[model samples]
Target: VYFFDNKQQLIKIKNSRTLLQCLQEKEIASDKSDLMKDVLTVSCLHDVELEQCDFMAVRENKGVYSLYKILEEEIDAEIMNFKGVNFGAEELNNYVVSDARPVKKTITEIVKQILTYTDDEWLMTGGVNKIGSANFYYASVKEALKTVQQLGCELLFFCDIDGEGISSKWVEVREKIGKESDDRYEVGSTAIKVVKTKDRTNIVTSLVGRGKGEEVGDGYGRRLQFDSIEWTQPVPKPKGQSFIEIKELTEKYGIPTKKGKMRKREQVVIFEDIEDKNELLNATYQTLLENSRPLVQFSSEVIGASSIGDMVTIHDYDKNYHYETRVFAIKNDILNNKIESSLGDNLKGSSASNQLSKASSGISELKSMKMNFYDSTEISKWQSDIIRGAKGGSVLLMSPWDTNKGQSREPYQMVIMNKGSLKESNHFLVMNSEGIGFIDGDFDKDKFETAWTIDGTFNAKFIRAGVLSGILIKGNIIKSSDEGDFQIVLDGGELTFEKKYDSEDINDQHGHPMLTMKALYTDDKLNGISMVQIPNYSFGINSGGLMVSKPVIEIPKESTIDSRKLNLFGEVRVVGDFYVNDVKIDSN
Candidate 1:
């Protein structure tokens, strides 16, 4: 099964387990909240898009959190002012008639040097080639490369979402990427586009000493060039290439191509001194070759066997056009695999997870690093991001399927529910962004209710039945005055009522008891001030100043004899005006 279900697009977790558990148990099979960060480093290696990649960020659209390919945004080197990678402020030159072999500064070597000096996230390539000599400088990696490419070598810059960061260089040295077949990769409907088709039309051109190279406080360097069609046969016919001493301020650029139908596409370059005449010619030749060849561009079909800068060959039979070109770009639709075919099969085998739990590599590397995708609003419709400081990086949930969205501080969430019933009262217990929630009652609105939260707030609208230290007295608030507190203590059968005494000293401000109802089991022949319904010969214990019943001055003995069948739990004194029916009872 794939990481996502094809139809619903929800996370396809198995064994009644959460996505977090899959990372924790190192489980190819997960149970619940059992995993930590370095989430991608877990058993998900069987996943093609996720394989070899580390934790980046998360997105979600519906109810599913998605983890897919990453980033876009240009980083211009010139504006960035990379100080370490600058070529000094002076014109440099290297004239070569194969002159005693100038120090070997190949394009690839210079590229590495420039990148090494810049120290960006970009890394070196596994393969490289020796292009023309390079006495070139005065720029960053991107700055030098613009001119470096004039040496006639293609370069590939791409991101490998797998743990390795960024790298760009000539790759697949002699190897070939899977041919750009019609059906294999997602080569869009536009199919084949042919730029120019020429068969032996005889187009060979030449370019003179080129553009200004970097800086020149000293005298400008000059070099003149010409080919066979010009030297001997400047005699008549106008074809082939030419490179004259174009630096002649008053003189025009020289050329042998004196034809209207076949134009001489004169291209002037900016340079104080190019020094290397061969590069100038190479650029010219390459330009001419490109203009002569059948050029074409089509949307690439992303695949694993090939990447940016890897050479790919395309074949067309109807137009009889076939050529080899380095891949320029490949849009990997990791989130939305537009054309789905054998994709599910590729993600079927779940073997990658078992390997990670062995050594458990790549933890600190992740925790030590921090990344923040700041501007959240203008991002994709299905995603948002937060800027977090170095607190172990931010946690996110990603996917763009339907309508799932949330905000949370915890890395993991645990949910217990009956899915078939969305409106079950208290049937859903979700530990989520708002802390603990038991939602779904008549007033619940089918969402989470803040039954409890992180800030020590536990609210209960109506406690139908609950046990607190096993108190059997079930009760409800009758209006509730903000005066004091009342607690039913079942142990020792005591009901205590305390008034909140207002005071500055916290010791004096604690609840002070006003009244208490205690159940006392006693057997007695009763006698009282009147007819004894329960208590007889009642007495109150005096503690300190005054603790029990007050206003007690006399105890009548013989005259008021009262008897009782059942004993009263404790002292009962009628405080209000005693009345039976309508007449108020008066006793002297």
Candidate 2:
């Protein structure tokens, strides 16, 4: 099953002075209060339009538009610099006001708004049949700073509902949060919004060295790192177990929020299948270690990367700094620790645990590294290994369907979830201004290289392409012959490039030097499509390449993808040559 049932949109906009430069505007004012910066960022006049890929943002109609007004009134209301503001709309022109007090809207509210929109309008909002949410986080941070400018709070509160995960590590969180803040929002003390669900007993026992009520006093408004419990297994916790009273607040704000406990959860893997899953998961990690992929965040020691041909080799060790043992990200001990303290305590009490501890005695942490270069051949080889694994009957961990799961930090592969083999003709040739598209089926060196060199001519109409990342290619820029000269069916033929087109000749302007397309992805499925401006291969963490690059518009792969389409996993080893578009990928 997919992680979600629908798509959610998160728009991030900075207050902008001009229409074209809307997304690039900076924060006007911001306030920081206990690490959480609740700011009132500025926005453009109430009705500017910002479109990114399939999603479109427009400030909801503000009050009513009047033809006549006093000059001062006009200046006050009309010319007031809206700065950059996030835009919201459904597929149709109908718009809804989301909760502005908090940056994120609840899933229920977003779904209700989607129901009010149409297919066409919703496409601009990343469509709605699926359940999910997308955020241009960096963009949102910028917008937040602008909001802070209005709030007058200097301290930003990076709060956590729980003491661990987000709260216990506010320092690290602040470092991440600070990357986007302008000089306005300064870091403040990290705080928690004492929730009912917090494990008070556990928190107290872990921190205060005292058992419930006896050691911990009943301090109502006191902020706590840990609290105590009288009878719970653990003695005390940071705060009493609590849940946010959201219903009243939601009703007051007229925004959508969840009430009853119907919170959607990940599909539970069958209890019986746990062993089988462990096997596959274990096998996957073993393969990764054998292949030398860097391991991180594991209780066991990390590995070092060494290369042979293109195969990376890694060695595992323990805290004692010796060859302790091999560990996976999904180790039993690690999972238990994150889920329940009892599980952790039990593991710690185990003989195996002791052995592991002894083995990891003096282990020191190592720095993690990412490969600097793309190994096309190595990628092909890895794909081959994956296919081999599939053939060997390894259970593939895939989304199983297309739906957005909010903020999953897990690195996922673009696996073929269907039940059939992929054929060349069945695959469409995808291309755009940057180059060609990356393959969704498999990372075959030959097939990928073929996609890199497609010419934008009339004969290549159906060949699909996505704007990879946007960039500006200076000089010899291409432009349209006329405003309406080179037009195919896109955004309803509203594809007019105003300034000097990338090329002087409309026909020859396909890969003009500069293109501008935002990297914002509202739908995860959109990642399957390739971009022309932004090179697909350049995708990496912290690379805001999508924002600064040129825009390359192409037929989205989603359009060509049949939602109900079926395909089987194939086992093909080409003996000779293969072609993706027109180039030979593999040689005999």
Candidate 3:
């Protein structure tokens, strides 16, 4: 039998007795058949740890069984395979390379993929086939629990939902005033919009507190050395829009205003994995209110059923004061039965029942560290910038697919984004230039590189050779300018590159014709047969030039056709008589 874990990873229980126990416990099997009495204790099933797993046992044979792991109601990364599986077609075209093997991914990578790739239907907690919804928290279970406790939010989980293993914490809830009062308290519908004010400036101000500034670090590479505030403008709203309607609340509570110049000391919050604009705004406001008070950190001796997300009232022996607040973080010594809690501030009017509401309302006596922002939009833009910086804005790429050094020594493929239909104009794929022409590059700088110009003209200039090689155009090779002496056109069913004889001797300084051609043919008309050109030839075919066609050859006046044998073969049958040039040379 196969089982699915909380993280949506599949596990196989091979030839295990726990499967039988599970079946009998569910009453799907014959309940009257007591396995403990009849069977003398089965073997090799005690190691099966099935906590936080949902599964079913498929009976393959009498004692043999097979399990197929599936997403019956939850979303798991291993099962979803966001990195391993091919994504939606539109997203694949955007930035992803096809046929990519699965790679290890972080929670940040998973969130980025979901937010950028999945459509609205998948982004908002709705299931996408068996993959489930992208609408879920990126934080871990413990972190989410702490957020629920500190933010005075509610943690809820349901089997009917796709985010099965994890619970969502509702920090911001809006009320709807309608004719029906029964449905007014619907939670998880509203979001807090966070935005930056316009009057923010690039100024930092340090302040001295009543006591010496305490040094604290969260061990997440963030360190709080001293107390300080930096001034910066609020993030602007979308184009053609005003700020969200939370300006009044921010102003009333001394939060940063979205407008008005000369607003000094703009606070900054760094929150990560929050994509919703409203949630970010609310978190920022929450940070502004929570950090305004003095930070209080004390070890509480309280013990019992208290956990990380619980609110407990503690009496400070030194200060002779009692304070009730949600536990921000905690460490426990299981052997000694001792507990240490990190409580930022005291909840003055906060009782156990109203702590959540007070927290949501941005009212707290306790001061804490400002929240951090890990804005996805900003991160995505930075990621693109990193790529651009690495590649120098060119589409040159190297493959580390089989390299041992983590980076290739040289680039194997490059897409010239100079100017073309398949360039970086709209999307990321490199396709044909016009119809059938494509740019070709060489790794060695000495070799020739051929491509069309930004204006749809062709050029084949050598980078190191200091001479012209050749160019291939899909349709027909035309003159580069009015002074272009040579041209190629299609007449009837034959290819023509012949120019009118302008009485100019088209020959090199060595007294040899500069142009030469041979038989060229294609079975399909759509095939782009290459027409070559040689330098130092102008106007028309001169001495030592050759014109040979696979099926037919054409020679206008003043065009030179110098060959040892200009052989012409034909089959002729004369029913009357055949004459040659009025000389009466009879046909035999």
Q: Write the per-residue lDDT of candidate 2 for residues 186-296, one digit (tens) a residue.
A: 112111111112121211000012111322346543322112222233222124632112233223323234763322111111122222322333333233223222222
lDDT of 1 by residue, 398-468 (tens): 22221234554333544555433323323656676678876564424466667778896878674678666
1 versus 2: better lDDT goes to: 1
Candidate 2, TM-score vs. the true structure?
0.13
Model 1 CA RMSD to the hidden true structure, in angstroms? 33.2
Q: What order do you get sorting by lDDT, best first? A: 1, 3, 2
Candidate 2, position 238, lDDT = 22
Worst lDDT run of 10 residues, candidate 1, spans: 81-90
Candidate 2 ranges beyond 4 A from true positions: 1-84, 89-120, 123-231, 234-588
**lDDT (Cα) of model 1:** 0.36
Better of 1 and 3 by lDDT: 1
Prediction 3 TM-score vs. true: 0.21
